[PDB]
Enzyme design. Structure first.
Site, short mmCIF file in Angstrom:
data_model
loop_
_atom_site.label_atom_id
_atom_site.label_comp_id
_atom_site.label_asym_id
_atom_site.label_seq_id
_atom_site.Cartn_x
_atom_site.Cartn_y
_atom_site.Cartn_z
N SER A 156 0.69 -1.32 -0.23
CA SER A 156 0.10 -0.15 0.08
C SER A 156 0.87 1.22 -0.03
O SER A 156 0.75 2.17 -1.02
CB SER A 156 -0.89 0.01 1.43
OG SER A 156 -1.81 1.33 1.36
N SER A 157 1.76 1.24 0.94
CA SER A 157 2.67 2.43 1.08
C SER A 157 3.47 2.81 0.03
O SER A 157 4.12 3.73 -0.34
CB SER A 157 3.31 2.57 2.50
OG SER A 157 2.38 3.05 3.57
N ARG B 151 10.41 -2.09 29.71
CA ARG B 151 9.26 -2.31 29.25
C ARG B 151 8.80 -3.57 28.92
O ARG B 151 9.55 -4.59 29.08
CB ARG B 151 9.44 -1.43 27.88
CG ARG B 151 10.63 -2.15 26.86
CD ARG B 151 10.89 -1.03 25.81
NE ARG B 151 9.77 -0.94 24.77
CZ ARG B 151 10.03 -0.38 23.43
NH1 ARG B 151 11.11 -0.04 23.04
NH2 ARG B 151 9.09 -0.54 22.72
N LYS C 13 14.48 23.36 12.46
CA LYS C 13 13.15 23.61 12.36
C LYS C 13 12.43 24.15 13.38
O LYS C 13 11.21 24.93 13.29
CB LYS C 13 12.49 22.13 11.87
CG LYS C 13 13.02 21.53 10.53
CD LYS C 13 12.20 20.30 10.29
CE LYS C 13 10.78 20.55 9.38
NZ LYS C 13 10.88 21.79 8.37
C1 HEA Z 1 8.22 10.46 15.63
C2 HEA Z 1 8.75 9.37 15.80
C3 HEA Z 1 10.27 9.73 16.46
C4 HEA Z 1 11.13 10.55 16.31
C5 HEA Z 1 10.92 12.10 15.23
C6 HEA Z 1 12.35 10.34 16.90
C7 HEA Z 1 13.48 11.01 17.18
C8 HEA Z 1 14.71 10.53 17.44
N1 HEA Z 1 14.86 9.58 18.58
FE1 HEA Z 1 13.63 8.06 18.85
N2 HEA Z 1 12.25 6.59 18.87
C9 HEA Z 1 11.16 6.23 18.23
C10 HEA Z 1 10.19 7.45 17.67
C11 HEA Z 1 10.99 8.54 17.19
N3 HEA Z 1 12.23 9.03 17.71
C12 HEA Z 1 10.42 5.13 18.47
C13 HEA Z 1 9.06 4.80 18.39
C14 HEA Z 1 11.31 4.41 19.26
C15 HEA Z 1 11.50 2.75 19.76
C16 HEA Z 1 10.84 1.97 18.86
C17 HEA Z 1 10.71 0.68 19.89
O1 HEA Z 1 11.80 0.24 20.33
O2 HEA Z 1 9.62 0.28 19.76
C18 HEA Z 1 12.48 5.34 19.46
C19 HEA Z 1 13.75 4.95 19.92
C20 HEA Z 1 14.99 5.51 19.78
C21 HEA Z 1 16.15 5.13 20.34
C22 HEA Z 1 16.51 3.64 20.71
C23 HEA Z 1 16.42 3.57 22.45
C24 HEA Z 1 16.55 2.18 22.87
O3 HEA Z 1 15.48 1.24 22.22
O4 HEA Z 1 17.25 1.93 23.79
C25 HEA Z 1 17.17 6.15 20.09
C26 HEA Z 1 18.62 6.03 20.42
O5 HEA Z 1 19.43 6.89 19.88
C27 HEA Z 1 16.26 7.12 19.77
C28 HEA Z 1 16.87 8.50 19.42
C29 HEA Z 1 16.18 9.61 18.82
C30 HEA Z 1 16.71 10.92 18.46
C31 HEA Z 1 18.11 11.48 18.59
C32 HEA Z 1 15.76 11.56 17.61
C33 HEA Z 1 15.91 12.89 16.93
O6 HEA Z 1 15.59 12.88 15.72
C34 HEA Z 1 15.29 13.96 17.86
C35 HEA Z 1 15.84 15.54 17.44
C36 HEA Z 1 15.05 16.55 18.00
C37 HEA Z 1 15.56 17.17 19.16
C38 HEA Z 1 16.99 17.12 19.54
C39 HEA Z 1 14.58 18.40 19.58
C40 HEA Z 1 14.58 19.81 18.81
C41 HEA Z 1 15.94 20.30 18.74
C42 HEA Z 1 16.25 21.51 19.29
C43 HEA Z 1 15.36 22.48 20.12
C44 HEA Z 1 17.86 21.85 18.99
C45 HEA Z 1 19.00 21.94 20.00
C46 HEA Z 1 19.02 20.57 20.62
C47 HEA Z 1 20.33 20.02 20.96
C48 HEA Z 1 21.62 20.61 20.82
C49 HEA Z 1 20.11 18.57 21.62
N4 HEA Z 1 15.23 6.76 19.44
#
Ligand code: HEA
Ligand SMILES: CCCCCCCCCCCCCCCCCC(=O)OC[C@H](COP(=O)([O-])OCC(O)COP(=O)([O-])OC[C@@H](COC(=O)CCCCCCCCCCCCCCCCC)OC(=O)CCCCCCCCCCCCCCCCC)OC(=O)CCCCCCCCCCCCCCCCC
Ligand SMILES: CCCCCCCCCCCCCCCCCC(=O)OCC(COC(=O)CCCCCCCCCCCCCCCCC)OC(=O)CCCCCCCCCCCCCCCCC
Ligand code: HEA
Ligand SMILES: CCCCC/C=C\C/C=C\C/C=C\C/C=C\CCCC(=O)O[C@H](COC(=O)CCCCCCCCCCCCCCCCC)COP(=O)(O)OCCN
Ligand SMILES: CCCCCC/C=C\CCCCCCCCCC(=O)O[C@H](COC(=O)CCCCCCCCCCCCCCC)COP(=O)(O)OC[C@@H](O)CO
Ligand SMILES: CCCCCC/C=C\CCCCCCCCCC(=O)O[C@H](COC(=O)CCCCCCCCCCCCCCC)COP(=O)(O)OC[C@@H](O)CO
Ligand SMILES: CCCCCC/C=C\CCCCCCCCCC(=O)O[C@H](COC(=O)CCCCCCCCCCCCCCC)COP(=O)(O)OC[C@@H](O)CO
Ligand SMILES: CCCCCCCCCCO[C@@H]1O[C@H](CO)[C@@H](O[C@H]2O[C@H](CO)[C@@H](O)[C@H](O)[C@H]2O)[C@H](O)[C@H]1O
Ligand SMILES: C[C@H](CCC(=O)O)[C@H]1CC[C@H]2[C@@H]3[C@H](O)C[C@@H]4C[C@H](O)CC[C@]4(C)[C@H]3C[C@H](O)[C@]12C
Ligand SMILES: C[C@H](CCC(=O)O)[C@H]1CC[C@H]2[C@@H]3[C@H](O)C[C@@H]4C[C@H](O)CC[C@]4(C)[C@H]3C[C@H](O)[C@]12C
Ligand SMILES: C[C@H](CCC(=O)O)[C@H]1CC[C@H]2[C@@H]3[C@H](O)C[C@@H]4C[C@H](O)CC[C@]4(C)[C@H]3C[C@H](O)[C@]12C
Ligand code: CUA
Ligand SMILES: [Cu+2]
Ligand SMILES: [Mg+2]
Ligand code: NA
Ligand code: NA
Ligand SMILES: [Zn+2]
Lengths: 58, 259, 514, 84, 94, 227, 48, 105
Positions: free
Chosen positions: C156-157, C438, C319
């Site tokens: 689908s996607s 978890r 952003k």
């Molecule tokens: C919308 C969905 C989404 C998004 C966008 C993100 C974004 C990010 N995620 Fe996350 N993540 C998940 C959904 C998402 N994640 C999910 C579902 C899982 C787990 C899945 C599972 O195990 O079931 C997960 C798991 C996950 C892990 C694994 C953890 C573990 O299982 O042990 C990690 C590890 O690095 C991680 C890191 C990050 C980081 C660095 C971002 C970066 O993209 C975030 C960047 C944003 C910012 C930093 C904030 C805005 C920034 C500023 C205001 C700038 C100034 C900031 C600084 C200088 C730091 N994510």
């Protein structure tokens, strides 16, 4: 063989309101009904199979 | 009345019958794997073939017979086919990753070596090399077909396309024989797993690509293609070169390097 | 006429409506599953008295929310309604294939239902790792039905991605370059590229799991020389791009909403916003193994994945700061959609920052597979996606329907949800830091206080969801028809009225080159 | 990186037909020779019931459950060895 | 043997594809495949906007490389001005 | 173990865990500061009737808000990576202990000298002795010598599990066919608890880990008595 | 006075503090006395 | 981009065009209120006299309202601007919004 594309162009451009999947004539309708019957009938059958498989007899 | 060049498609049942065929094929595979029955699967395969037939039939009606494929519409179909091919490349990339993962780090169960203890690979210089020459040759002949079509030459287009198809069939028959003769099987650990699933999906794509070339052959026989407008042929040729390139990566990786 | 229009559609607006209806229904299923999770955890002990069922609920919760609620709503629903209108196109490139992308989803959902009804369900986690998901620890059809559900959702996607990329590249006015298209359109194009490249890899991995379960392959079975960890690589090679796929259309809608209710003609820093989304898309392919820091990976590989993961904060920050710079100097309209978008900016920032904590593999050793990860992604994913979806839904409901919502009720709804999701998830940080795993149906007693609060939070969000349905009912019940919409000179999707006619842009826009 | 051939000026059907009959099909013919010449059955090896081979975690959904899909009794032993 | 037997588009194109082909030969663009070139856009020399009805949407890229397009309906009658840059447009129906 | 209403990490039992606590403090301060600054700026943008809606030039400010986040990331990454490579540095263990995950319990093998191995199961809630901890106690604890570098090797004989002890900063997945190594050093005697940390089926919640850290001579006599 | 859905493509009135002079008058149709008032507006406003 | 005086002078010249039309009056005021400033009295003067040449009393009142609005919480600006404009208001017979009761909610 001879190029009979013009004939087919006339047929499929006839101003008869038919959608393209039926515009070839009666055979399109037959193949459409067969397909849709198989799909809807098969889908009902799959739901029956889910019903059967949802309960212990494994 | 529109004054853009794009195609507003008539409402169509084929998306729904295609989606239902997908439900029937998958629930049919489940029934076959777990409930010892082929019934649902055969219905799903049948409705899937009927859907593909009528859908692509309608695309020919819309283009050759009704004239909706302006240059802008054709340009979209070019992008669509290229993107479809890219997605298929990435699908194969997962199986190459599986193959390199297992063969570069053979585990103790294998004997700690590749090929595993007890596996006797095919000789890559025998039928595998022949299959390579067959698909490479078919890439030359389909290029001849393409230039004959662009030059307006009906007979030589048909001859070259027939040769291309014959080679595709030759590859498939050779591969079927090789499958039968192979001393290892899909259940022979990760060697058999990677070998048959990867070459197996490739062989399915050869059959798909050959079918598509055969569709083009009969459309050509019926004069559908003009010397300048023949995207179904171009798409089949692009797909065919993709099948050839995936083979070259399989040959080098699994048959030769992996032996 | 009914069947022709709604089962045989080739119309981007009607298909978008189908997607929104499908996604809203899936959201109910996903919410009910989430309440069962939190009911099991709302007091110590066992509620379901059957942890295999618990695991099945958790697994299905995630699949429903990701594949049947967020992606259909953002891409299938808002994408199909808005993208052709925002570029003046008369429909999508492949209007009939578009309908099959829709109709593959009810069968996909049916397969997932089937998985939970047969045998004892797929109690695997949405990651479906072997060998737990293999044919000895999950014998029988449940996991294969799950695999096939993912196959159909994936087709689908992928086909939808082909459609959107082609539409966005090929069907703009001839004068409009890619740098004259709105940010939401960019966000969909980039999401579609991510889908195109990532889903085939998932398809490959789950197909290998299918053949290990049914054809005696051993891709993931050490007895044959296979490796469970290879499945994890293939899964997360898809699964990190997937989390960016889940948020990128959200970023696009947030850009439009913030611009609009600031009274601005344009977002701040347009080319920086394009750069940031492209950079996030690209980096999203080179970080996946941060889902695998505890599997036994070499130290240099951990150092690379830590560093590459952290870099994504730089374009993301551009952003966030550009949204703030869009508000700056605005004639702020405190509409309910604006509240959703402001809640998005803050809660997305919190969750992104806990993602930066997790990117540090040394700390992730202690936080991995704990509620600290659950808290990270329900901020950044669950709230991020839901708040952008609600913002977009409230903002564009009058376009899609021709009718207005009651703004006071919509603001009440926002308030209740904002309290509920923060009560639910904020304490889960403490549970994770203090070591609660978890995927547990019960917990050592010390963890009672925060699990109790979190579960009470989950009921507040339930009340919000019920109120949302009433609010949609009240709008269609009262029939307040839209008259005028401001800022149409910079929001082309409104310029054909509310709702726009079945066919729009039959005569394309005039845009000259100069 | 263009082989030792060398014939353009305005590419065309005639050149690609030349390549098809003068290089591509002769190569297939040569490889067909090489193959159907190294053919003939090889000595099948002693059967050893290695545990990483002949995997059966679930019966196959066809036949008696124990035969692979393109089972060749001459060269494919069952988990218990070669057949009659 | 360089023989023939393949139809040309001139011979066999039909429908909208043929309309586009024939108009292109006359240098015409009834199906809007090309971007129109701006006039100076003064009240004396307005951009002329063809239409098959009595209104059409204009998008104005006011300055080269602007990413923001300014959209408005242009109606039959007196020339109208882009609300952002003031450049003039006049509808030429039918 | 965790205690009621705990907000942060368990107290450190090993020097590496103490490192992680100070590094977490460093990182969380940055997290708080950035979150607060964003919340504050949001409120600042939203609290004036003054307006400015004409086009705003971006390139100058985008330098600040790329370079300052890049500097902050480097300020996190430097101590992050230092701890990572410390944890990796060679230490020469005195003892190797294996643990095998199973559905649903852990077994332990201490085979440097003698064939010592045993199974370790959760104490059922109905059989807890008064004062013992629900879902955390085991019948047979992992006795270990305190103040000594120990090599733990982790695997599984069925599905994935994951062997974790939060107060030692330890979490190593248990993967069949794989032998993962981690090292462990407790600064103190006592009882240190963990729980299975990779979903492994219906009793994932109920296969905990209890280390019992004692002086070497007690460990030796215990080991002898477990043969 | 009365805004119609079928008028969506025409310039419309809005009250927005950042768009002080909208594209159309709020009231386009004038009574006899309102016509006389618009004429008087052409003379010195001190006499209004 | 240029000096304050140069900016104000462009805007005075814009409104002072003798045959400025209604569209140009609105475009001018609607563009001007986008900037981070309250327009100088000399700009407002030129805009009000444009209103007079266009026989549009209502838009003159509206312009005085938008001066007050652009000042935001700086309650001192609008009374200053009205003070500076009183000779023009008297000459043209322009009543302020306050004199018309249009500051009541
Ligand atoms: C919308 C969905 C989404 C998004 C966008 C993100 C974004 C990010 N995620 Fe996350 N993540 C998940 C959904 C998402 N994640 C999910 C579902 C899982 C787990 C899945 C599972 O195990 O079931 C997960 C798991 C996950 C892990 C694994 C953890 C573990 O299982 O042990 C990690 C590890 O690095 C991680 C890191 C990050 C980081 C660095 C971002 C970066 O993209 C975030 C960047 C944003 C910012 C930093 C904030 C805005 C920034 C500023 C205001 C700038 C100034 C900031 C600084 C200088 C730091 N994510
Ligand atoms: C009531 C009937 C109900 C029956 C239900 C039962 C059916 C099950 C099968 C379903 C197939 C549906 C087809 C219905 C056709 C009805 C036609 C009438 O008339 P003109 O100028 O007007 O004519 C031009 C002509 C267009 O020009 C043409 O003539 C087109 C020619 C089509 C050739 C199709 C070739 C298939 C070839 C396979 C060979 C494989 C080789 C691989 C390599 C070799 C290995 C050894 O226009 C068209 O016809 C449009 C044609 C559609 C084009 C697109 C079709 C592609 C569809 C492919 C679906 C099939 C998949 C098979 C491939 C995968 C497995 C092999 C007319 O003219 C042509 C009709 C011929 C169509 C043949 C379609 C494929 C046949 C399949 C063999 C079946 C295998 C069984 C599998 C079953 C699963 C359990
Ligand atoms: C952030 C989302 C909104 C939050 C909604 C809830 C608000 C929570 C606070 C709203 C203020 C946010 C920070 C609260 C931290 C409070 C405890 C602490 O100091 O914890 C430190 C560590 C543990 O470290 C230690 O080992 C020291 C323990 C010290 C114990 C002393 C006794 C304290 C008494 C008990 C406190 C009861 C806790 C409250 C229970 C909370 C239940 C809901 O915990 C942690 O890491 C928690 C990890 C959170 C990471 C996400 C960052 C969110 C930032 C929000 C900032 C915006 C500005 C606020 C302004 C926010 C207003 C919008
Ligand atoms: C878009 C994604 C999404 C969304 C919206 C949600 C929404 C919610 N989730 Fe979700 N959750 C996941 C994705 C999501 N979740 C994933 C991927 C997992 C991991 C599964 C695994 O471990 O395999 C998970 C796991 C997870 C757990 C951990 C289960 C465990 O570890 O044992 C919990 C526990 O509280 C939880 C609760 C909630 C609640 C209370 C809500 C909501 O009720 C909050 C309010 C939101 C709504 C009401 C939506 C309304 C929208 C339309 C109606 N979720
Ligand atoms: C000329 C070459 C052959 C061409 C293709 C032949 C059949 C392949 C069909 C297409 C599927 C391709 C891969 C499917 C997996 C296995 C087939 C591998 C190829 C093959 O045919 O493997 C054979 C085994 O087939 C077997 O198990 C079982 C075969 C039947 C079961 C098919 C199971 C269906 C799997 C579903 C795939 C889902 C795909 C989803 C894609 C989604 C993308 C978005 C090998 O035979 P063997 O006796 O073990 O050894 C030979 C010993 N002499
Ligand atoms: C742009 C490229 C720049 C280089 C980036 C790094 C990519 C490296 C692949 C290197 C593979 C060899 C590693 C040394 C041996 C070993 C495992 O190795 C394995 O399987 C490895 C198997 C392959 C893993 C691939 C991981 C990335 C996959 C990306 C997919 C790209 C697809 C492109 C389309 C053709 C473990 O011990
Ligand atoms: C268990 C078995 C199940 C699977 C069996 C699959 C069987 C075989 C399918 C073979 C594919 C045949 C495709 C035939 C398409 C014919 C229609 C066509 O080719 O349509 C052309 C447009 O192209 C177009 O849509 C291009 C559209 C082409 C898409 C085809 C791509 C192949 C997809 C196959 C499915 C992938 C499966 C992957 C599995 C991992 C028509 O335009 P022109 O040619 O310019 O003509 C117009 C001129 O005449 C005017 O002068
Ligand atoms: C476990 C087993 C699971 C089985 C799951 C099976 C799932 C689905 C059943 C598929 C039924 C397919 C029916 C035929 C679909 C043909 C689509 C097509 O050909 O779409 C074309 C567009 O896609 C293009 O070109 C280029 C794209 C062509 C795509 C063709 C179909 C591919 C379907 C499988 C794809 C899988 C991807 C594999 C890689 C991961 C035409 O677009 P339309 O909007 O129609 O028309 C536009 C008009 O202007 C044409 O005149
Ligand atoms: C929605 C998709 C449904 C999930 C599909 C699960 C697979 C179902 C195949 C089961 O079919 C059943 O098998 C039984 C034993 O062979 C028969 O006795 C029974 O009559 C049959 O009907
Ligand atoms: C009948 C047709 C003549 C052209 C036309 O119809 O006018 C001819 C021209 C090319 C011929 C085909 C090509 O020569 C290629 C093939 C050659 C094989 O020896 C016979 C079948 C084969 C597939 C031919 C069948 C048939 O005689 C074709 C199709
Ligand atoms: C994770 C993946 C192996 C997947 C597999 O086990 O199948 C491997 C393959 C190539 C590896 C990369 C290449 O070896 C190049 C880099 C080597 C550096 O020491 C670490 C980062 C570095 C970028 C590696 C990270 C990671 O270990 C990669 C990407
Ligand atoms: C060159 C390009 C497009 C400019 C345009 O044609 O309008 C712009 C758009 C976004 C810009 C980038 C973003 O603003 C983010 C970074 C900001 C830093 O100040 C310079 C590098 C930096 C990475 C910028 C480089 C460059 O100026 C970019 C990439
Ligand atoms: Cu063992 Cu979880
Ligand atoms: Cu990730
Ligand atoms: Mg884990
Ligand atoms: Na061509
Ligand atoms: Na419980
Ligand atoms: Zn303009």
């Amino acid at each position: 063989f001879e190029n009979r594309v013009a004939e087919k162009q006339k047929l499929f451009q006839e101003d008869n309101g038919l959608p393209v999947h039926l515009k070839g004539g009666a055979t399109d309708n037959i193949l459409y009904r067969v397909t849709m019957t198989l799909c809807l009938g098969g889908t009902l059958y799959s739901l029956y199979c889910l019903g059967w498989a949802s309960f212990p007899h494994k | 009345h529109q004054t853009h060049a794009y195609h507003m498609v008539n409402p169509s049942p084929w998306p729904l019958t295609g989606a239902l065929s997908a439900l029937l094929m998958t629930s049919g595979l489940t029934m076959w794997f777990h409930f010892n029955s082929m019934t649902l699967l055969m219905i799903g395969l049948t409705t899937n073939m009927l859907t593909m037939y009528q859908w692509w039939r309608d695309v020919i009606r819309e283009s050759t017979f009704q004239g909706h494929h302006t240059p802008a519409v054709q340009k979209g179909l070019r992008y669509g086919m290229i993107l479809f091919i890219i997605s298929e490349v990435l699908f194969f990339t997962g199986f190459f990753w599986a193959f390199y993962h297992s063969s570069l780090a053979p585990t103790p169960e294998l004997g700690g070596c590749w090929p595993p203890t007890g596996i006797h690979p095919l000789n890559p210089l025998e039928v595998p090399l022949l299959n390579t020459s067959v698909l490479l040759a078919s890439g030359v002949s389909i290029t001849w077909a393409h230039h004959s079509l662009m030059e307006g030459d009906r007979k030589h287009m048909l001859q070259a396309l027939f040769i291309t198809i014959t080679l595709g069939v030759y590859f498939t028959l050779l591969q079927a024989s090789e499958y039968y003769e192979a001393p290892f099987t899909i259940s022979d650990g990760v060697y058999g797993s990677t070998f048959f699933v990867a070459t197996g999906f490739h062989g399915l794509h050869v059959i798909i690509g050959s079918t598509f070339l055969i569709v083009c052959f009969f459309r050509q026989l019926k004069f559908h293609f003009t010397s300048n407008h023949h995207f179904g042929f171009e798409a089949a040729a692009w797909y065919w070169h993709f099948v050839d390139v995936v083979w070259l990566f399989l040959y080098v990786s699994i048959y030769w390097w992996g032996s | 006429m009914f069947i022709n229009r709604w089962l045989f559609s080739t119309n981007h607006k009607d298909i978008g409506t189908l997607y929104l209806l499908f996604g809203a229904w899936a959201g109910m299923v996903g919410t009910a599953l989430s309440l069962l999770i939190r009911a099991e955890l709302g007091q110590p002990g066992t509620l379901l008295g059957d942890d295999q069922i618990y695991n099945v609920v958790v697994t299905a919760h995630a699949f429903v929310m990701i594949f049947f609620m967020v992606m259909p709503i953002m891409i299938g629903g808002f994408g199909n309604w808005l993208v052709p209108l925002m570029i003046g196109a008369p429909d999508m490139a492949f209007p009939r294939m578009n309908n099959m992308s829709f109709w593959l989803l009810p069968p996909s959902f049916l397969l997932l239902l089937a998985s939970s009804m047969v045998e004892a369900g797929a109690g695997t986690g949405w990651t479906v790792y072997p060998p737990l998901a293999g044919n000895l620890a999950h014998a029988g059809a449940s996991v294969d039905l799950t695999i096939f559900s993912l196959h159909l959702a994936g087709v689908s996607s992928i086909l939808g991605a082909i459609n959107f990329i082609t539409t966005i590249i090929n069907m703009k006015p001839p004068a409009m370059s890619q740098y004259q298209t709105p940010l939401f359109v960019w966000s969909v194009m980039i999401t579609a590229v991510l889908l195109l490249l990532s889903l085939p890899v998932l398809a490959a991995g789950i197909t290998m799991l299918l053949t290990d379960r049914n054809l005696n392959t051993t891709f993931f079975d050490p007895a044959g020389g296979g490796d469970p960890i290879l499945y994890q690589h293939l899964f997360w090679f898809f699964g990190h791009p997937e989390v960016y796929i889940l948020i990128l259309p959200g970023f696009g809608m947030i850009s439009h909403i913030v611009t609009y209710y600031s009274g601005k003609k344009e977002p701040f820093g347009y080319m920086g916003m394009v750069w940031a989304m492209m950079s996030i898309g690209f980096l999203g392919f080179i970080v996946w193994a941060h889902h695998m820091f505890t599997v036994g990976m070499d130290v240099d590989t951990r150092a690379y994945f830590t560093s590459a993961t952290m870099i994504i904060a730089i374009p993301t920050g551009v952003k966030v700061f550009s949204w703030l710079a869009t508000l700056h100097g605005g004639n702020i309209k405190w509409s309910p959609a604006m509240m959703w978008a402001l809640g998005f900016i803050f809660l997305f920032t919190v969750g992104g920052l806990t993602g930066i904590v997790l990117a540090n593999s040394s700390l992730d050793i202690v936080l991995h597979d704990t509620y600290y990860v659950v808290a990270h992604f329900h901020y950044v994913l669950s709230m991020g996606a839901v708040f952008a979806i609600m913002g977009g839904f409230v903002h564009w409901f009058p376009l899609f329907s021709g009718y207005t919502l009651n703004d006071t009720w919509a603001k009440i709804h926002f308030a209740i949800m904002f309290v509920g999701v923060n009560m639910t998830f904020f304490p889960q940080h403490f549970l994770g830091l203090s070591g609660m795993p978890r995927r547990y149906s019960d917990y050592p007693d010390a963890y009672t206080m925060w699990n109790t609060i979190s579960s009470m939070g989950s009921f507040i969000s339930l009340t919000a969801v019920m109120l949302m349905v009433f609010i949609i009912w009240e709008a269609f019940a009262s029939k307040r028809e839209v008259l005028t919409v401001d800022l149409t000179t910079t929001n082309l999707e409104w310029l054909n009225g509310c709702p726009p006619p079945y066919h729009t842009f039959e005569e394309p826009t005039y845009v000259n080159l100069k | 990186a263009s082989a030792a051939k060398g014939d353009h000026g305005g590419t065309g059907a005639r050149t690609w037909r030349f390549l098809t009959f003068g290089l591509a099909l002769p190569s297939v013919a040569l490889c067909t020779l090489n193959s159907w010449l190294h053919s003939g059955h090889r000595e099948r090896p002693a059967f050893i019931p290695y545990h990483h081979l002949r995997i059966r975690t679930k019966p196959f959904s066809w036949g008696d459950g124990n035969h692979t899909f393109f089972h060749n009794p001459r060269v494919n032993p069952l988990p218990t060895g070669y057949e009659k | 043997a360089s023989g023939g037997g393949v139809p040309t588009d001139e011979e066999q194109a039909t429908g909208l594809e043929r309309e586009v082909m024939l108009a292109a030969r006359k240098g015409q663009d009834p199906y809007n495949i090309l971007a129109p070139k701006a006039t100076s856009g003064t009240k004396e020399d307005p951009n002329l906007v063809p239409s098959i009805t009595n209104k059409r949407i204009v998008g104005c890229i006011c300055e080269e490389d602007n990413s923001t397009v300014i959209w408005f309906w242009l109606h039959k009658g007196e020339a109208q001005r882009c609300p952002s840059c003031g450049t003039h447009y006049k509808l030429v129906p039918h | 173990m965790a205690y009621p209403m705990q907000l942060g990490f368990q107290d450190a039992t090993s020097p590496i865990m103490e490192e992680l606590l100070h590094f977490h403090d460093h990182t969380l301060m940055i997290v708080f500061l950035i979150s607060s600054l964003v919340l504050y700026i949001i409120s600042l943008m939203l609290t004036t009737k003054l307006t400015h809606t004409s086009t705003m030039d971006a390139q100058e400010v985008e330098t600040i808000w790329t370079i300052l986040p890049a500097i902050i990331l480097i300020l996190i990454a430097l101590p992050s990576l230092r701890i990572l490579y410390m944890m990796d540095e060679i230490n020469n263990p005195s003892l190797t202990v294996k643990t095998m995950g199973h559905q649903w319990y852990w077994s332990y093998e201490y085979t440097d000298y003698e064939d010592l191995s045993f199974d370790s199961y959760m104490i059922p809630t109905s059989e807890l002795k008064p004062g013992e901890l629900r879902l955390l106690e085991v019948d047979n604890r992992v006795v270990l010598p305190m103040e000594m570098t120990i090599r733990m090797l982790v695997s599984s004989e069925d599905v994935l599990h994951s062997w974790a002890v939060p107060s030692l900063g330890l979490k190593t997945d248990a993967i069949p066919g794989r032998l993962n190594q981690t090292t462990l050093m407790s600064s103190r005697p006592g009882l240190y608890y963990g729980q299975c940390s990779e979903i492994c089926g219906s009793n994932h919640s109920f296969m905990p880990i209890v280390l019992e850290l004692v002086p070497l001579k007690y460990f030796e006599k215990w080991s002898a008595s477990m043969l | 006075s009365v805004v119609k859905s079928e008028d969506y493509a025409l310039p419309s009135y809005v009250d927005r503090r950042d768009y002080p002079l909208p594209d159309v008058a709020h009231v386009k149709n004038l009574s006899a006395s309102q016509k006389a008032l618009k004429e008087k507006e052409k003379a010195s406003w001190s006499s209004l | 981009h240029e000096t304050d005086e140069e900016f104000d002078a462009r805007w005075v010249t814009y409104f002072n065009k003798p045959d400025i039309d209604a569209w140009e009056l609105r475009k001018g005021m609607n563009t001007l209120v986008g900037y981070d400033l309250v327009p100088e009295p000399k700009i407002i003067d030129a805009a009000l006299r444009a209103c007079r040449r266009l026989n549009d009393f209502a838009s003159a009142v509206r312009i005085l309202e938008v001066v007050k609005d652009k000042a935001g919480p700086h309650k001192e600006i609008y009374p200053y601007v009205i003070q500076e404009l009183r000779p023009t208001l008297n000459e043209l017979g322009i009543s302020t919004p306050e004199e018309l009761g249009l500051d009541k909610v």
